[PDB]
Swiss-Prot record:
Subunit of the oligosaccharyl transferase (OST) complex that catalyzes the initial transfer of a defined glycan (Glc(3)Man(9)GlcNAc(2) in eukaryotes) from the lipid carrier dolichol-pyrophosphate to an asparagine residue within an Asn-X-Ser/Thr consensus motif in nascent polypeptide chains, the first step in protein N-glycosylation. N-glycosylation occurs cotranslationally and the complex associates with the Sec61 complex at the channel-forming translocon complex that mediates protein translocation across the endoplasmic reticulum (ER). All subunits are required for a maximal enzyme activity. The chain crosses the membrane at residues 10-28. It is found in: Endoplasmic reticulum membrane. Disulfide bonds: none annotated. One of its GO terms (molecular function) is protein-macromolecule adaptor activity. Its main location: endoplasmic reticulum. Changing M19K: Severe growth defect; abolishes interaction with OST3. Changing I24K: Disrupts interaction between OST3 and STT3. It holds the Pfam family Ost4. The keyword Protein transport does not apply. Pathway: Protein modification; protein glycosylation. Keywords: Endoplasmic reticulum, Membrane, Signal-anchor, Transmembrane, Transmembrane helix. This is Dolichyl-diphosphooligosaccharide--protein glycosyltransferase subunit OST4.
Amino acid sequence: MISDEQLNSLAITFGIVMMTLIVIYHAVDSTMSPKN
């Protein structure tokens, strides 16, 4: 993250991959949340 760029197409790409590691980091670091 340097200048004006369209590279905010990472904050989707990366960010479904960060949303799976955060919600995973909540099962490891914090208390276990199961869905099913």
